[PDB]
Design a protein around this ligand. Structure first.
Ligand code: NA
Ligand code: NA
Ligand code: NA
Ligand code: NA
Ligand code: NA
Ligand code: NA
Lengths: 167, 167
């Protein structure tokens, strides 16, 4: 815990015992010399903050640290030329490793939706956000696919509630 | 146009000929003495700005003005006690007037999703945002409901693209 405590003290710049969105963003590198995607930061804090305080305490931060390190290790695996972005094939391999079953064309769609750099590849911070969204959307789809055939049938109002649950 | 020009000059506080999100928000009342929902502001500017400039010029602003006034007139109709919020029954009537076909229970869901004031009713600014979202989601549903029976059948990847189109 000593290592993690030392890291926590450095990130918690106001020394309040709660790391904010701004503090976490400032402590994170996306490997492209631009500020770490604040939407990704918001997602991560929101997932690990158990008390609706717009931040993480030390115990929650240990979760954040492991989460971010785990994502780093995935991205490091697949960014084969260490360019700071992964291409459609590298992304394909990454997501297939997770068990996703997606067509070649979908990988282009995902890159376009989340790549803030406008290069047709995806940087680390944007990759986490895309994956978070993909996981949430896939969890929701799994709930409605009652016979596991890769299709859902939903009414207008089921659909509205489905979209509202994203969130 | 004279009236609209005079209004435009007053809202365009920096006198640049482009009204920003912050300028529009500052010029709008939600009737509850709290700042007008910035998400609603973002939606409205984004819809009327034809040039990706984070704002509206005078001609676009005439559209904004009409849009906001039209919404005001709907809300004024249905806020029968002039309290500044509409209840589930008032909302039901409002949306039915638009031609929406929604169950009584859905109106509770919509209020919960969009009411920032936490009163179980919905204020003007939040009502616009809810309606904007409802219209977009209903347009998307209409695209997929190929036989107009109020149901859709979609594959996993169709569903992902559907959600990605929201936006
Ligand atoms: Na802090
Ligand atoms: Na690369
Ligand atoms: Na199914
Ligand atoms: Na201005
Ligand atoms: Na009322
Ligand atoms: Na149908």
């Amino acid at each position: 815990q000593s290592f993690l405590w030392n890291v926590f003290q450095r990130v918690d710049k106001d020394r309040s015992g709660v790391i904010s969105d701004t503090e976490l963003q400032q402590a994170l590198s996306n490997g492209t010399w631009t500020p770490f995607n604040p939407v990704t930061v918001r997602s991560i804090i929101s997932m690990f903050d158990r008390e609706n305080k717009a931040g993480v305490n030390f115990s929650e931060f240990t979760g954040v640290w492991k989460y971010i390190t785990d994502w780093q290790n995935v991205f490091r695996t697949y960014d084969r030329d260490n360019s700071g972005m992964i291409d459609k094939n590298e992304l394909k391999q990454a997501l297939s490793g997770f068990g996703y079953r997606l067509s070649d064309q979908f990988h282009d769609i995902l890159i376009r939706k989340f790549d803030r750099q406008g290069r047709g590849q995806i940087a680390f911070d944007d990759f986490i956000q895309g994956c978070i969204v993909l996981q949430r959307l896939t969890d929701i789809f799994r709930r409605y696919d009652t016979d596991q055939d890769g299709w859902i049938q939903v009414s207008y109002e089921q659909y509205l509630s489905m979209v509202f649950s994203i969130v």
